Ligand binder design. Structure first.
Ligand SMILES: [K+]
Ligand SMILES: [Mg+2]
Lengths: 92, 102, 55, 95, 144, 354
RNA sequence: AGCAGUACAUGCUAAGACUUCACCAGUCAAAGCGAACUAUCCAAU
């Protein structure tokens, strides 16, 4: 349960919640899964390493600027044209 | 002293992506839908599906000087035709599967 | 003894040591090229160094 | 091929085969392409890449290589950090 | 115990014709390398110039016409001195770009000939489309 | 062995006796114009159109919409010709065109376009988006009545719906503002349907909104047969079609059978099929207007599932078929070492009995 | 025909195929990364 995680710092829990909202379920539980290995030891180690990267990435405020994925590029152009269609209430 | 060139996959045959449909010294069969061309004019499937041979109107690229000269000298009303080979995609690109119930 | 084209080895100026053989006309000065260099993963100046064979 | 050595009365291995081939425990033989190191200047990148591949021998060749080598060369080995370790056993092979 | 609203089919069926195209996973018709123009697109801009009129179409690779602007239309014709000049070609681009955004069409390919591309009419028509939000270049297909 | 052609062969009318005297194309464009025309024509031989062209019923699509308005062509042509002569008379108009400074008012163009070609262009767009295929099982109507739907985004802004433009679920959280030209005494039905939203049945739809017996343009006074529900496209399910349908009633209609509770948060109760709904009321109401937009998942959708729908949010992924490999053989002659990796399921070393 | 022109990402990697045929050798190639974005042994190192 991310919100009530004493071990994680309160500013970090907020940043993790927005960044990894897609992982948090209806109950507010951050869910991490790994299936990259046959052995449960390696799978569990992958999940724990994921938790560590989340806390580290959260505390590193200057997120590195990087080239967007090709999927993001068109979505940016689509979002830009969608705003172009927005109009203003003529009489308000 | 002979070699084997020609249609590897006949009409209605099932091909996988990368299958060589035909090999030719010169363009005898032209690439249609989902059919790639190699450096040696080899025709290969770009998708999985059924091979089809059709007769389509031929329009060369505007910068293909040799071919553009031919069509410009044709009598008006005359259309060039060529044999094209196509692959009809048999399967969809993918499906949407339920993966989580958050 | 004589050929129209010469096979010569181009060495990268980066000092990595990557070299590739290339063909140039016999009656030409030492060739310099911006050939791609795998070691540095980018294009780099290449200097003609040694004659390998005559075609 | 020597089937019965003069001093031991035992079959002998053809050392020419050991120099050129790798035998996987599953019975496959790996080899290099002929001329992979020769005249690279006159070969296209695509031709050069397939020339440096490690390729399998056919059934007929594999059975011949098996006869030319004694049982020692067919034993299972457990070399440390062997690059071909995973290839010694076949997977999902119905036949 | 089982919520009624939580009944979900294992496979989702999206019948939207543009769904896979919008996601960039729909396959374009590759091939036709020896002939002109290419079929490797989802949507294309085609400009038909006649002796008296200018017409610009946005059509799917399957041959359907999504949106179109033509000087034959009275809505456009009444504001034009001439329907066959550069101004008409620029006006068609501006009108078509607006109709494209309204139809959710943001990307398409333009396949002109060497002389058509050089001409000022197509340069002005292309500029109007780009200034109207149309990119005139499609995103690459996502194979993996 | 030769077989006679099964019809007129191409380039057969061309008289070869006087080849020099015939008129040649002389240009790439003229040949291409003729080439495209010939391709469209039907041919007895096998063509690309056969295998790839869609197979649709030859019978013409039934028209279930309002009748076309009556126009006097003679008077219309008269006024238009006089309008162009007036415009061309101005010296400033000719100078602007010659100097390439003239432009057209986009707003005035769209106003006239809505009155004239707009209904037929909206029908073409609806046909391209499959609305007729999915809503009326291939039946088509011309949206004679321009339907203006806009979503109030914030206080001073409005997100319009223009037949396919993308609107986010956040912008569609509240019922939109709907306006149309209706004469006094008329009664209308307005429904909002999600063609691609249904999570259980492929062919079913969700009734997001249904207003019936609307007197004129007063949408607020229309009976709320189904309360408005925001579009909830599932995450990873792609782009969904949301279509507003305006029906022109011929008389007051009893929609008790189609009524739904207020609030209606049961997906079973909102399961809807426009064809079945229209089929029972075809006698009394005619499809008049059409608007639609494209919607994809956004953060606001999660609120709809957890709060409004009281369910867990379903997530989907686009899954491609597993790569094809030929049946593995015991001896893969001339294949690279990596051939064995194509048929390997685990990357970690295995030890068997040891 | 036992070559030439002219480029220097004739880079890397990798599904699936072809092949004079038996072998050896030879040939084509999607996607991806990065760019552009228009004979054997022998002998020399
Ligand atoms: K659905
Ligand atoms: Mg590629």
């Amino acid at each position: 349960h991310l919100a009530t995680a004493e071990w994680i710092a309160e500013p970090v829990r907020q940043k993790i919640a927005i960044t990894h909202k897609n992982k948090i379920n209806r109950l507010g539980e951050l869910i991490l899964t790994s299936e990259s290995s046959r052995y449960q030891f390696r799978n569990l180690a992958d999940c724990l390493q994921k938790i560590r990267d989340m806390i580290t990435e959260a505390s590193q405020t200057p997120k590195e600027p990087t080239k967007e994925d090709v999927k993001l590029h068109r979505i940016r152009i689509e979002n830009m044209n969608r705003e172009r269609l927005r109009q203003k209430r003529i009489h308000s | 002293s002979g070699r084997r060139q020609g249609i590897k996959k006949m009409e209605g045959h099932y091909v996988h992506a990368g299958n060589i449909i035909a090999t030719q010294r010169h363009f005898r069969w032209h690439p249609g839908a989902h059919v790639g061309v190699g450096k040696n004019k080899c025709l290969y499937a770009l998708e999985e599906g059924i091979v089809r041979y059709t007769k389509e109107v031929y329009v060369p690229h505007p910068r293909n000087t040799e071919a553009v000269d031919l069509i410009t000298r044709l009598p008006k009303g005359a259309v060039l035709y060529k044999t094209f080979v196509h692959v009809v995609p048999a399967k969809p690109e993918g499906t949407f599967k339920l993966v989580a119930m958050l | 003894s004589k050929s129209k084209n010469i096979l010569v080895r181009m060495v990268s100026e980066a000092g990595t040591g990557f070299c590739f053989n290339t063909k140039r006309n016999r009656l030409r000065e030492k060739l310099t090229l911006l050939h791609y260099d795998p070691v540095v993963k980018q294009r780099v100046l290449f200097v003609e160094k040694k004659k390998i064979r005559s075609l | 091929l020597t089937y019965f050595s003069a001093r031991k009365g035992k079959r002998k291995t053809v050392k020419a085969v050991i120099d050129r081939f790798l035998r996987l425990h599953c019975g496959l033989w790996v080899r290099r392409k002929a001329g992979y190191k020769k005249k690279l200047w006159k070969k296209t990148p695509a031709r050069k890449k397939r020339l440096r591949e490690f390729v399998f021998c056919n059934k007929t060749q594999s059975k011949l290589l098996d006869k030319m080598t004694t049982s020692f060369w067919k034993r299972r080995n457990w070399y440390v950090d062997d690059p071909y370790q995973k290839y010694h056993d076949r997977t999902n092979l119905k036949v | 115990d089982p919520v009624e609203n939580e009944a979900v089919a294992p496979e989702f069926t999206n019948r939207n014709p543009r769904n896979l195209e919008l996601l960039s996973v729909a396959r374009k018709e590759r091939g036709w390398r020896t002939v002109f123009p290419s079929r490797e697109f989802w949507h294309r801009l085609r400009v038909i110039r006649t002796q008296h009129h200018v017409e610009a179409l946005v059509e799917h690779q399957n041959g359907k016409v999504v949106v179109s602007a033509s000087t034959r239309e009275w809505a456009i014709k009444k504001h034009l001195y001439s329907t066959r000049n550069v101004v008409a070609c620029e006006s068609i681009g501006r009108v078509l770009a607006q109709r494209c955004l309204e139809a959710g069409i943001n990307f398409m390919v333009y396949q002109p000939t060497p002389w058509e591309a050089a001409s000022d009419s197509m340069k002005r028509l292309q500029s109007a489309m780009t200034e109207g939000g149309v990119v005139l270049r499609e995103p690459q297909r996502i194979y993996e | 062995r030769r077989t006679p052609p099964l019809g007129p062969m191409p380039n057969s009318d061309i008289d070869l006796s006087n080849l020099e005297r015939l008129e040649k194309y002389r240009s790439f464009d003229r040949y291409r114009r003729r080439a495209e025309q010939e391709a469209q024509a039907p041919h007895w031989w096998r063509t690309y159109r056969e295998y790839f062209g869609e197979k649709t019923d030859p019978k013409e699509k039934i028209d279930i919409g309002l009748p076309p308005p009556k126009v006097s062509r003679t008077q219309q042509l008269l006024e238009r010709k006089q309008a162009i002569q007036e415009l061309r008379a101005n010296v400033e108009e000719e100078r602007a065109a010659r100097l390439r400074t003239a432009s057209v008012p986009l707003d005035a163009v769209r106003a006239e376009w809505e009155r004239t070609c707009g209904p037929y262009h909206k029908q073409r767009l609806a046909e391209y988006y499959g609305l007729y295929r999915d809503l009326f099982h291939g039946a088509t109507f011309v949206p004679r009545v321009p339907l203006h739907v806009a979503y109030a985004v914030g206080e001073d802004d409005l997100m319009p719906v223009y037949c396919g433009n993308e609107v986010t679920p956040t912008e569609a959280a509240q019922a939109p503002e709907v306006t149309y030209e209706a004469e006094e005494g008329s009664l209308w039905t307005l429904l909002l349907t999600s063609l691609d939203g249904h999570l259980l049945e492929p062919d079913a739809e969700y009734l997001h909104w249904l207003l019936t017996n609307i007197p004129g343009n007063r949408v607020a006074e229309g009976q709320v047969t189904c309360p408005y529900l925001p579009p909830f496209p599932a995450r990873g399910s792609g782009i969904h079609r949301l279509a507003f349908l305006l029906f022109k009633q011929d008389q007051p209609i009893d929609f008790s059978e189609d009524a739904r509770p207020s609030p209606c948060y049961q997906l079973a109760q909102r399961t809807f099929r426009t064809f079945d709904f229209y089929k029972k009321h075809q006698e009394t109401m005619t499809p008049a207007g059409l608007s639609f937009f494209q919607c994809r998942w956004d953060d606001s959708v999660t609120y709809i599932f957890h709060q409004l729908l009281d369910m867990r949010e379903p997530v989907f992924e686009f899954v491609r078929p597993p790569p094809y490999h030929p049946k593995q053989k015991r001896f893969p002659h001339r294949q690279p070492l990596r051939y064995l990796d194509r048929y390997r399921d685990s990357h970690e070393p295995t030890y068997g009995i040891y």
